[PDB]
Amino acid sequence: GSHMEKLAKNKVISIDAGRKYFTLNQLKRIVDKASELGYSDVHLLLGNDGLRFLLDDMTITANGKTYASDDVKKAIIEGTKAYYDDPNGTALTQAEVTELIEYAKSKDIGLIPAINSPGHMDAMLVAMEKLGIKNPQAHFDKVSKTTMDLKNEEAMNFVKALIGKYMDFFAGKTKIFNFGTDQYANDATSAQGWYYLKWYQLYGKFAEYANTLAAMAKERGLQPMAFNDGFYYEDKDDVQFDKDVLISYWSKGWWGYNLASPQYLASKGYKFLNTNGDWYYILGQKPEDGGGFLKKAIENTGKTPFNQLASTKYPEVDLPTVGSMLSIWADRPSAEYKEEEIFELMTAFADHNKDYFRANYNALREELAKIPSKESLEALDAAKTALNYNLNRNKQAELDTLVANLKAALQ
Numbered sequence: 001g002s003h004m005e006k007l008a009k010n011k012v013i014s015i016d017a018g019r020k021y022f023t024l025n026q027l028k029r030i031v032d033k034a035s036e037l038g039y040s041d042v043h044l045l046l047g048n049d050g051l052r053f054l055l056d057d058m059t060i061t062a063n064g065k066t067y068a069s070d071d072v073k074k075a076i077i078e079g080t081k082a083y084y085d086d087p088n089g090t091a092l093t094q095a096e097v098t099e100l101i102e103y104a105k106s107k108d109i110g111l112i113p114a115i116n117s118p119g120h121m122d123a124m125l126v127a128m129e130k131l132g133i134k135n136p137q138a139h140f141d142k143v144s145k146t147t148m149d150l151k152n153e154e155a156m157n158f159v160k161a162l163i164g165k166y167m168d169f170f171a172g173k174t175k176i177f178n179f180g181t182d183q184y185a186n187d188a189t190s191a192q193g194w195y196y197l198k199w200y201q202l203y204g205k206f207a208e209y210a211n212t213l214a215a216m217a218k219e220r221g222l223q224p225m226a227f228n229d230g231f232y233y234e235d236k237d238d239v240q241f242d243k244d245v246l247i248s249y250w251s252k253g254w255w256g257y258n259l260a261s262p263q264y265l266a267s268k269g270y271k272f273l274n275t276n277g278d279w280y281y282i283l284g285q286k287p288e289d290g291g292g293f294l295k296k297a298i299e300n301t302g303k304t305p306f307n308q309l310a311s312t313k314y315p316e317v318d319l320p321t322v323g324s325m326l327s328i329w330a331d332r333p334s335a336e337y338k339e340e341e342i343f344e345l346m347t348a349f350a351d352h353n354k355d356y357f358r359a360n361y362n363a364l365r366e367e368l369a370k371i372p373s374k375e376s377l378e379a380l381d382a383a384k385t386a387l388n389y390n391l392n393r394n395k396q397a398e399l400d401t402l403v404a405n406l407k408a409a410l411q
């Protein structure tokens with residue numbers, strides 16, 4: 001019950017770089033601002049509708065045949081462009097994402113990648129078509145454009161191998177890997193995908209796929225993360241799920257979309273990354289549209305407590321969370337990304353929870369990088385011993401004089 005508990009928790013900013021393209025430098029500045037504000041990780045969706053990340057070797061081995069690296073790359077580029085041909089760019093390179101991870105590591109910032117499936121995979125579906133894999137899309141009220149058919153082995157096998165190749169990359173580089181599994185065939189079932197899975201006795205098939213993805217993460221030394229949607233839908237435990245999955249809990253849903261309660265998932269032994277929907281911001285969203293516009297997300301950043309999970313009340317309901325995630329989405333990826341908006345929402349969330357967030361260590365690290373008579377060395381050694389790396393956002397002044405004493409000793 002000491003000091004450490006609050007600071008040990010995760011403070012995450014989520015960027016939807018799957019739907020919309022973000023430049024390496026844009027993400028670097030988000031990472032820098034995250035480090036400055038006191039965040040711990042940057043959650044970066046790279047596969048979300050579009051697939052905006054290419055490895056150097058994209059060779060895939062599936063269905064007793066292989067798909068050549070250059071053939072895979074072109075098909076993915078075409079898929080992402082088919083979803084949305086972003087004039088700012090198509091997909092991040094291996095070298096760019098690698099530099100982002102090392103840059104973030106230098107600022108005590110984790111990177112949490114997300115490659116979504118079996119929903120939110122418009123780019124992958126079309127890529128598979130271009131790769132010869134016929135009809136990968138789910139089929140209900142109409143043929144889906146976002147979701148994979150669970151009965152199609154050819155598509156399932158490829159996608160598993162594809163996510164596996166990404167998982168091979170992020171292994172040893174990042175602690176967590178998010179595979180999503182949210183909003184199954186929402187476009188093809190009027191946002192009732194889990195009800196449709198139940199109906200056609202395919203919900204067990206989804207579990208098998210999700211559990212496979214969790215094992216794939218674990219055996220590669222990655223903590224599996226997924227969204228809550230498809231985990232124990234409607235509090236039924238007829239179909240079981242992997243318990244080692246870090247659940248990013250965003251909502252309990254709405255009418256006809258009966259997601260499991262946080263209370264039920266906690267009773268199954270799950271830990272939560274509090275990804276409360278209240279803190280959502282969709283780029284370009286205005287107050288007139290309702291939902292997650294900027295003013296509401298800033299307003300709710302103080303309204304909705306740090307530990308409070310969606311559909312629950314804190315502290316009346318107090319469930320185990322590893323930390324909280326604030327999310328920026330790009331539902332309409334053509335909307336202008338304005339850095340100032342995200343920075344304001346990020347700042348607000350940190351300012352209301354100064355006990356959870358770190359202090360600003362950018363000044364300290366610059367002054368420690370300037371370090372190359374024994375009496376003058378006595379002072380330089382003394383200021384170094386007096387440094388405190390454990391400060392939170394409430395004590396910026398406390399840290400400001402400690403770094404000032406280091407600057408004075410160095411001269």
Ligand SMILES: CC(=O)N[C@@H]1[C@@H](O)[C@H](O[C@@H]2O[C@H](CO)[C@@H](O)[C@H](O[C@H]3O[C@H](CO)[C@@H](O)[C@H](O)[C@@H]3O[C@@H]3O[C@H](CO)[C@@H](O)[C@H](O)[C@H]3NC(C)=O)[C@@H]2O)[C@@H](CO)O[C@H]1O
Binds near residue numbers: 182253254
């Ligand atoms: C009182 C009541 O419950 N009314 C229902 C109403 O709320 C429902 O509309 C829904 O509202 C929620 C907010 O409470 C909103 O989040 C929902 O949007 C999600 O789902 C739609 C598909 O229906 C999808 O188009 C959106 O993209 C969105 O999905 C998530 O949200 C973010 C940002 O919006 C996305 O970027 C994410 O990709 C996605 N997933 C995650 C994990 O974040 C929805 O509009 C309606 C529904 O008919 O029903 C009322 O009864």
